[PDB]
């Protein structure tokens, strides 16, 4: 682990506004962005694209031949951002849990030099508490300036 784990507190309505700002301020080579349902993966990818950014998405409601080709394109550096649900790429230096995961196991799969930013809503609080204790480690409120040494290669 060379991952630095932050959270931002948001409501659902602030999520896109929040991400767009992370898209501007972080120095991203590639990002992976996790949501909690295939519907939301699609909506967000569209949102990201309308805001002016490059964007692939994968989820479970796709043919495997199709999911695997997109994932391979992404691995090969043929897009900047990938929105996905749950399943490293060296160029990925930032991971965003647009939707906070529900189990420590699932978090570990998403987080396993990089940054992992969590979007925490009032409704994510028992999961945050439970996931922290279960892994030992704390997820610190997102600072005003993050040290490029922590996630930029």
């Amino acid at each position: 682990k060379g991952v630095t784990q932050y959270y931002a507190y948001v409501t659902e309505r602030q999520k896109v506004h929040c991400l767009n700002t992370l898209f501007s301020r972080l120095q991203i080579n590639q990002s992976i962005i996790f949501c909690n349902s295939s519907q939301r993966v699609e909506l967000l990818a569209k949102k990201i694209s309308q805001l002016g950014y490059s964007c692939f998405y994968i989820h479970a409601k796709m043919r495997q031949e199709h999911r695997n080709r997109v994932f391979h394109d992404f691995r090969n550096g043929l897009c900047r951002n990938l929105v996905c649900t749950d399943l490293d790429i060296q160029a990925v230096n930032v991971v965003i849990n647009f939707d906070f995961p529900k189990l420590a196991e699932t978090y570990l799969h998403r987080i396993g030099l990089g940054l992992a930013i969590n979007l925490i809503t009032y409704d994510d609080r028992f999961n945050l508490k439970s996931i922290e204790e279960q892994l030992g480690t704390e997820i610190k409120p997102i600072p005003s300036n993050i040290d490029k040494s922590l996630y930029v290669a």
Binding site: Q14, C18, N20, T21
Partner: peptide, 26 residues
């Protein structure tokens, strides 16, 4: 969709993480 920065700091304090974790533990 504001062409302006999201206020992380302001929204961080809407939520007292220590207070909340203390309460749930009781």
């Amino acid at each position: 969709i504001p062409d302006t920065d999201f206020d992380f700091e302001g929204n961080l304090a809407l939520f007292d993480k220590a207070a909340v974790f203390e309460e749930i533990d009781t």
